[PDB]
Design an enzyme around this catalytic site. Sequence first.
Site, PDB file in Angstrom:
ATOM      1  N   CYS A 106      51.350  43.748  31.209  1.00 34.22           N
ATOM      2  CA  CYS A 106      52.570  43.705  32.012  1.00 34.22           C
ATOM      3  C   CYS A 106      53.113  45.131  32.142  1.00 34.22           C
ATOM      4  CB  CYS A 106      53.621  42.780  31.388  1.00 34.22           C
ATOM      5  SG  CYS A 106      55.129  42.572  32.387  1.00 34.22           S
ATOM      6  N   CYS A 109      56.988  45.240  32.067  1.00 36.50           N
ATOM      7  CA  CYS A 109      57.722  44.889  30.811  1.00 36.50           C
ATOM      8  C   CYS A 109      56.868  44.364  29.666  1.00 36.50           C
ATOM      9  CB  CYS A 109      58.954  44.023  31.101  1.00 36.50           C
ATOM     10  SG  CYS A 109      58.495  42.505  32.036  1.00 36.50           S
ATOM     11  N   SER A 110      56.667  43.053  29.542  1.00 37.00           N
ATOM     12  CA  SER A 110      56.022  42.504  28.347  1.00 37.00           C
ATOM     13  C   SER A 110      55.487  41.072  28.523  1.00 37.00           C
ATOM     14  CB  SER A 110      57.002  42.531  27.173  1.00 37.00           C
ATOM     15  OG  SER A 110      58.186  41.826  27.501  1.00 37.00           O
ATOM     16  N   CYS A 111      55.483  40.592  29.760  1.00 38.11           N
ATOM     17  CA  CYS A 111      55.102  39.195  30.077  1.00 38.11           C
ATOM     18  C   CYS A 111      53.780  38.891  29.445  1.00 38.11           C
ATOM     19  CB  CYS A 111      55.147  39.028  31.588  1.00 38.11           C
ATOM     20  SG  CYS A 111      56.758  39.780  32.084  1.00 38.11           S
TER      21      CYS A 111
END
Lengths: 201, 219
Positions: A106, A109-111
């Site tokens: 991601c 971000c961090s998905c």
Amino acid sequence: HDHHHDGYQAPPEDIALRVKALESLLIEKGLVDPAAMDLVVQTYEHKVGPRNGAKVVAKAWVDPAYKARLLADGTAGIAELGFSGVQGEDMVILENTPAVHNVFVCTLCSCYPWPTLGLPPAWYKAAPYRSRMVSDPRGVLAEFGLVIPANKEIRVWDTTAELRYMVLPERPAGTEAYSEEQLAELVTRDSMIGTGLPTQP
Amino acid sequence: MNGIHDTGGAHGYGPVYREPNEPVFRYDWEKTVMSLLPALLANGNFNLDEFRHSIQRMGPAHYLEGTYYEHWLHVFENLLVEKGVLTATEVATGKAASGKTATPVLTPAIVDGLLSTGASAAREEGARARFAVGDKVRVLNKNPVGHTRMPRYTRGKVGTVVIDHGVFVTPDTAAHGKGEHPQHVYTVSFTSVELWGQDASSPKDTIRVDLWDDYLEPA
Ligand SMILES: [Co+3]
């Protein structure tokens, strides 16, 4: 030098107090319920983790019918083993083959697929991995001790939408008649992110 | 928003260091911060898209220096004020202005059910699909100051639609109180060369990105 931006740098000295102050505020206003919060923590600390995805992989390895269902409908597929929910509502399973190596990230971000892998490690959520994975996959993978053959296509999937990805790694050679449970033991978290391969017996 | 969070293709962040045997939570305070998110989302205090854009709006240095859960802590301290759920003073002092005026939506009885169910962004109907798998598409050159999910590295680039995932909420509008404006989301395949150029590329490698219908135009 020190860790600065790789996700493992030291938090501020007063961070725990800041967190306690906000928590008290939110509790006092009636916005959050500490008891419920504890259950949330327990869920991701003890109940949800990469063992879940490992079971999915093992089953797919031994059961071609399940594998087909899983690849056709990831969400329904993982639900057969009782996994579902937050950050895994719309799953897509990526099949590694001799011709294709899949890996996901991601960049924004961090998905990450919580229901099958649990909460992401700090490195997955940090700038080093996120910035470089989409431009120099081979360079990043080499750092994890994984060298992909030059003639093998690497497909990097950026998790920019509300689809969540998990890699179905290739079954290691020499694992004939292994049970789902023995096979599952070989499936590492990295192997389901695409940053490593399943253990070789 | 062309912020520091849009990291794709950046140089200088260095090696991907990874902790051996990393715990789910490395500090106790992270447990509190993490568990707050589901609690506040359940209240409907803000939506996930607003949450993401709030993180994008923290100071660039703060963003780089802060460990992951400091990003979340930032959102709670700032987005709750922007939404009018808390005042600045309350946040600063950590003392509520006037007692227990609300009731927690996330209660022990529903934690398991809520976590097991989540909330899909998929919607029954929305804008019709303009593209089919196999179509060559170009990502539009747009540079919104607000929330968006088209990474800077894809803009102006040509790729091949490889999957139509169906209809989803549009984050660009959902983060700014303009409604859901549901439309199709596609996985688009770009060659290494197309994204990074001749020199910086490998012939085999491809990068796939999930993009909303109106992010795109026929190539
Ligand atoms: Co993310």
